[PDB]
């Protein structure tokens, strides 16, 4: 019967280990100390502290039923850290989702000297929000019938924390969730059209390259070549790899050269450079596909990391708020399966370090280096 603690403990090790490798990666690797990682490091801290302080002590309550091994003063303290590190983990993940969106539709303010300050005030707000939501628990302690901790269960009663579980769950989960849902459908939409603005502009670049290869006057070659300059300069905007955008710079440079010959009246000299453009295109055809190939791929991973979020915290926060409202429901049948949904919210702290690092090559090369010492 104590065997279940086996697998429960195999969930604690990755949480401690996984989140500790992220901290060791950002603080020791000189090539990983950019702004957006200082904020991801904070998510690992919360996920680490919840696997190092919350998750281990929560393991004792399953073994020592109706008992509290630690001093009774530390029961309201342990509960304070359960909500704190959890709300922080959720809001960090929420603040990541919104940045993943703004970082796509507008790569503005990409400087390393000024994007690091925004991360420092982005990280502090999350920790202040998480505190403000978890702060009332230690203030108004839990009421117990006994003084000795060996005869009590450390748990928040429905009566003493009724309006807190309701107004606290919204500010911690359903508020950032509402943001994460809209930022998701706006992100999948942000790369649905940009993946389409690249093709239609890429085909506008062909049709004009087809017509100037078949011309008789000097007006058609400069009408189609101007339509290329705009189309080529817009397709550059629809990319997230500077060398593919460098390919458009080379191309546009050749557009201006050939467009300069067209105004001098030399038709057959302009087409000499138009055939050179057809060569510039063939060099970046491969990288044009790997751009859309990486677009349809990034779209699905964003659906999984988002699906796993609602897959793990919903069963708890839905069951939690249900136990506060529904009186017809069997009170003992809800908190019997709620024990399960608590650990599902805990395991999220172990997947977060994985679904945000293993999809990157520089992290893998650095993890195996300290595993290797």
């Amino acid at each position: 019967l104590h065997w279940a603690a086996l697998l429960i403990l195999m969930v604690i090790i990755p949480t401690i280990g996984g989140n500790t490798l992220v901290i060791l990666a950002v603080s020791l690797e000189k090539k990983l100390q950019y702004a957006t990682n200082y904020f991801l490091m904070s998510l690992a801290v919360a996920d680490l502290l919840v696997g190092l302080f919350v998750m281990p002590i929560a393991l004792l309550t399953i073994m020592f039923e109706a008992m509290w091994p630690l001093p009774l003063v530390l029961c309201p303290a342990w509960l304070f850290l359960d909500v704190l590190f959890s709300t922080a983990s959720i809001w960090h993940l929420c603040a990541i989702s919104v940045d993943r969106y703004i970082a796509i539709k507008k790569p503005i303010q990409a400087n390393q000297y000024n994007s690091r300050a925004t991360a420092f005030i982005k990280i502090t707000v999350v920790w202040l929000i998480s505190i403000g939501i978890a702060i009332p628990v230690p203030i108004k302690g839990i009421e117990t019938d006994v003084d000795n901790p060996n005869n009590i269960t450390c748990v928040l009663t429905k009566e003493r924390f009724g309006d807190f579980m309701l107004f606290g769950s919204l500010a911690a989960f359903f508020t950032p969730l509402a943001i994460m849902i809209v930022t998701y459908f706006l992100t999948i939409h942000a790369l649905q059209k940009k993946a389409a603005d690249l093709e239609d502009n890429w085909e506008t670049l062909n049709d004009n390259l087809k017509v100037i290869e078949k011309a008789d006057n000097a007006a058609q070659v400069k009408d189609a070549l101007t339509k290329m300059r705009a189309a080529a300069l817009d397709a550059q905007k629809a990319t997230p790899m500077k060398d593919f955008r460098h390919g458009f710079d080379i191309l546009v440079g050749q557009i201006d050269d050939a467009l300069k010959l067209a105004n001098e009246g030399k038709v057959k000299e302009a087409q000499a450079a138009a055939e050179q453009l057809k060569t510039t295109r063939n060099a970046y055809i491969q990288k044009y596909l790997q751009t859309i190939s990486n677009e349809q791929r990034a779209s699905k991973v964003l659906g999984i990391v988002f699906f796993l979020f609602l897959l793990m915290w919903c069963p708890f926060f839905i069951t939690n708020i249900t136990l506060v409202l529904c009186d017809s429901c069997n009170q003992t049948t809800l908190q019997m399966l709620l024990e399960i949904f608590v650990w599902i919210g805990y395991v999220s702290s172990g997947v977060n370090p994985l679904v945000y690092t293993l999809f990157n090559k520089t992290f893998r090369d650095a993890f195996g280096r300290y595993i290797t010492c």
Partner: antibody
Amino acid sequence: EVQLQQSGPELVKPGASVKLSCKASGYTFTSSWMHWVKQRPGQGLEWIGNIYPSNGGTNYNERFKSKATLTVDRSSNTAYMQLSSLTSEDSAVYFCARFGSFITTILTTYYNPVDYWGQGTTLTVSS
Amino acid sequence: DIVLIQSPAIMSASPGEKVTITCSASSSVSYMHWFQQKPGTSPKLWIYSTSNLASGVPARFSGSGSGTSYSLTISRMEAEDAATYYCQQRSSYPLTFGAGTKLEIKR
């Protein structure tokens, strides 16, 4: 206004089951635990056990563990207690009472006195 | 378990003369409560915590106690407070009570 109305005195044959009720009034019933106390004159007071109405969790004394069974009913807002295999030594007066709760913060622990006892129930066992 | 031994089982004191009920414990206990039961009525708590009086209790009562041995002292003996006195333990389970101490007025 806090009033705990209990069942009436009863004579029950030995070996039969007893069902004592304890009605609550004046408060939400679910805020505090519901303790039970048996008083045999001359020997003093003995603690039977308590129960928590919300979750239905029950705790018994090591002696009265197999004898008494504590239950509640949120619909009728009463606290029951079933004594099975009634012997002759189980003839006493039984009370239902709520006791204060200790409120424990990281700073210190407070205790508030809300102890309110209910009317006794004289139980007698004889043929 | 944690039995509570309170001596004397019965005592008689005249008005003015003063009383000190002792309630000694089997183990070291955090706090100690006190109850007064007048025959024909249910017991009502008189001193919650080691030294704090309940609601409606006269100021002549004064409870003091250490860890093992606790006590209940009064200030001015009057006929209204003649009853049995039990002390109980709320530190740990099972909750234990004292045997009782009956007070007789000497008139």
